[PDB]
Design a protein around this ligand. Structure first.
Ligand SMILES: [Mg+2]
Ligand SMILES: [Mg+2]
Ligand SMILES: [Mg+2]
Ligand SMILES: [Mg+2]
Ligand SMILES: [Mg+2]
Ligand SMILES: [Mg+2]
Ligand SMILES: [Mg+2]
Ligand SMILES: [Mg+2]
Ligand SMILES: [Mg+2]
Ligand SMILES: [Mg+2]
Ligand SMILES: [Mg+2]
Ligand SMILES: [Mg+2]
Ligand SMILES: [Mg+2]
Ligand SMILES: [Mg+2]
Ligand SMILES: [Mg+2]
Ligand SMILES: [Mg+2]
Ligand SMILES: [Mg+2]
Ligand SMILES: [Mg+2]
Ligand SMILES: [Mg+2]
Ligand SMILES: [Mg+2]
Ligand SMILES: [Mg+2]
Ligand SMILES: [Mg+2]
Ligand SMILES: [Mg+2]
Ligand SMILES: [Zn+2]
Lengths: 110, 42, 122, 53
RNA sequence: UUAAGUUAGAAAGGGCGCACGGUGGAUGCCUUGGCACUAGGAGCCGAAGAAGGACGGGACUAACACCGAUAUGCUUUGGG
RNA sequence: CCGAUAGUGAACCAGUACCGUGAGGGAAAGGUGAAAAGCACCCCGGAAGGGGAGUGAAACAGUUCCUGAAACCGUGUGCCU
RNA sequence: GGUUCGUGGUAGGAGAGCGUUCUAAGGGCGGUGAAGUCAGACCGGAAGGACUGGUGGAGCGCUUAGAAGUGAGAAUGCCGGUAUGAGUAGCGAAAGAAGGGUGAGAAUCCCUUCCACCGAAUAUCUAAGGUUUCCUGAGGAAGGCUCGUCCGCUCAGGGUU
RNA sequence: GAUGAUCAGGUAGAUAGGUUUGGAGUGGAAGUGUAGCGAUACAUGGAGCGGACAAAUACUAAUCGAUCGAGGACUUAACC
């Protein structure tokens, strides 16, 4: 019926992935891929590979029609955070969260 | 100009093994670091 | 006129560099803001070229970079950007009033999202 | 200088009502048959949709 | 049709409820390690070079353990 | 008597790492499964990572992998705005 | 068992209890699913206690007594995790440009040309100090305030007469 | 005009750039010639240059697309 792909622990902040994933949620996969191609954000290429993986899964594992697919679900979940430090003035160090994302895309017929 | 202006010689002359051994209190220090089980005496 | 995030002298250097690149290569890829400034400067150099006389050649020479375009061979003598502007480029726009350049929009650059364009002679 | 109170979830979410992207301005080409930004050159065909290069 | 009046519906976003995930490592269960003792033993090592180390030794060896240029072991007596 | 924030500082290569000129100070960090049977092969991807297929009692047990609370982050939507 | 009078309450006195870990004895539950965990519209005067279902995958109640590391919301408490501020401040003195190349991918790596900057130095030695950072070949998780095909980074080999 | 917005335009075209002709402004280009030993002067010639100002000109770019956006509740009165 539907096909999912996930990109786990991608080194991009979830907020930055979500602002893009919100454009493709509900679109036909052809339009979704165009939207990602012409959205100049660092998340666009990453989300494109998850979406094209989901479509390949739908065509190979579940013999679905790639011409009739819609993005049923798309969401970003928090992955494990890398903890870093930036030296600041007066010997003080400030925390830096190098956040990671789990990016899920589900495609379905209609 | 910061404290800590390194010198190989000054480090060993002030804090080295032979300087520690040269005084009774120096030997107390070695004995204490052996007792605690330090990898590095002196 | 555009300040292109540069001081006065830096901006004159940039314009001279790009103007020469467009005369030498005839098609270059750059940022939209740079292309919209280059069309003004290159079209004036081509106008000088069309005027053709020594006074115009020397006005162009004050602007165009001293770059070798090619080595042609008769002995083999180099061809300078100024010579290309007065002998190759200018003569091919002899019956065209202005509008010697065109800007094709390309798309944003990966590292800074800068809107890139092709600017070309024609 | 500093926040007097932490910002609630609701208030944070209201502030972000306008923090979003717009869809790109695009359309299907005739010669290519695929999407392209208007007033841009289409790489699928490899030139400007109308003016051949 | 005009007039006067009444009432619906709406969600850019938000709230409550529910469902499903993510993160995180609490809880339970577990134990390689500890803690306190009892009974017995033993209470010293060193110029015949100690305690503690450094550097080495393997077919390849970074670390640990073991060993000392006879170096990842040698002789012998027993066990098996 | 303790049962991993406890019990030794130290269940794990700990007086280590790290800090300090030095004396000295001094951590964090346990659990796949009965067994590696540790995922052939196919697919998307440069890889990571996934989806199948297979193993297994279980893989929502997938090399840090028993359980997996709460904060916190999201998707969906019954009622309200 | 009735009658009568009572039952606001801080410090504080008095009483009766709930629940937690462990022990003993008795009696049980449990792979036909223990503890834990999640959910619920159930029960008791309270502390609290069941039942049913999901998850979990091996231990645990109950009765009576006993013993305590026995109950947390506050200590600018300690440790850990995660928010808020916020896609905000910042990205650490400076001149770049285009063409060609490489590559899955290039403002950022390589090459070319022009431009620009230092030049009693921003050049050449060399002591200290550092200790392999040097060279070559691979790499692109992390590090690099962006990117990265690159690197004083990772992995191998080498190299000092 | 911070950005949004506003306003002028998008070939049903002067919206911007170029081009042509002007203008302000500067003050006499280069080249050549003449005079001077020379510095220089004079002539050619209010010359040459001339961001942002003016008018003409479709040469270049405003291509090609897409998206959103009514179908009009009930009650009563008055005409009708
Ligand atoms: Mg400092
Ligand atoms: Mg130091
Ligand atoms: Mg200057
Ligand atoms: Mg401990
Ligand atoms: Mg635990
Ligand atoms: Mg500890
Ligand atoms: Mg894990
Ligand atoms: Mg009363
Ligand atoms: Mg009372
Ligand atoms: Mg009392
Ligand atoms: Mg228990
Ligand atoms: Mg639990
Ligand atoms: Mg207590
Ligand atoms: Mg607390
Ligand atoms: Mg602010
Ligand atoms: Mg600001
Ligand atoms: Mg800023
Ligand atoms: Mg910098
Ligand atoms: Mg000087
Ligand atoms: Mg090197
Ligand atoms: Mg980076
Ligand atoms: Mg490299
Ligand atoms: Mg006009
Ligand atoms: Zn096309």
């Amino acid at each position: 019926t539907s096909a999912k792909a996930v990109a786990k622990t991608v080194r991009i902040a979830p907020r930055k992935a979500r602002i893009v994933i919100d454009l493709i949620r509900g679109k036909q996969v052809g339009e979704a891929i165009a939207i990602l191609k012409y959205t100049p954000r660092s998340a666009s290429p990453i989300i494109e590979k998850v979406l094209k993986s989901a479509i390949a899964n739908a065509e190979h594992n579940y013999d679905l029609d790639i011409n009739n697919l819609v993005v049923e679900e798309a969401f970003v979940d928090e992955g494990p955070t890398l903890k870093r430090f930036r030296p600041r003035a007066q010997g003080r160090a400030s925390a830096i969260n190098k956040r990671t994302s789990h990016i899920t895309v589900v495609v379905s017929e209609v | 100009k910061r404290t800590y202006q390194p010198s190989k010689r000054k480090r060993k002359k002030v804090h080295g093994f032979r300087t520690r051994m040269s005084t009774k209190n120096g030997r107390r220090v070695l004995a204490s670091r052996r007792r605690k089980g330090r990898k590095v005496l002196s | 006129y555009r300040k292109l995030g540069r001081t006065s002298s830096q901006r004159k250097a940039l314009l001279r560099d790009l103007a020469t690149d467009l005369i030498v290569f005839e098609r270059i890829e750059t940022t939209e803001a740079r292309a919209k400034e280059i069309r003004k400067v290159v079209e004036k150099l081509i106008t000088s070229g069309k005027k053709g006389d020594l006074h115009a050649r020397r006005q162009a020479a004050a602007f165009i970079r001293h770059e070798v375009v090619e080595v042609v061979q008769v002995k083999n003598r180099p061809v300078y950007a100024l010579q290309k502007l007065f002998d190759d480029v200018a003569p091919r726009y002899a019956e065209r009033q202005g509008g010697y350049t065109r800007i094709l929009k390309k798309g944003p650059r990966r590292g800074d999202g800068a809107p890139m364009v092709i600017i070309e002679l024609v | 200088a500093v926040p007097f109170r932490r910002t609630s979830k609701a208030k944070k979410r209201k502030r972000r009502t306008h923090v979003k992207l717009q869809l790109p301005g695009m359309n299907e080409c005739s010669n290519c048959g695929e999407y392209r930004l208007s007033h841009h050159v289409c790489p699928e065909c490899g030139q400007y949709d109308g003016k051949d290069v």
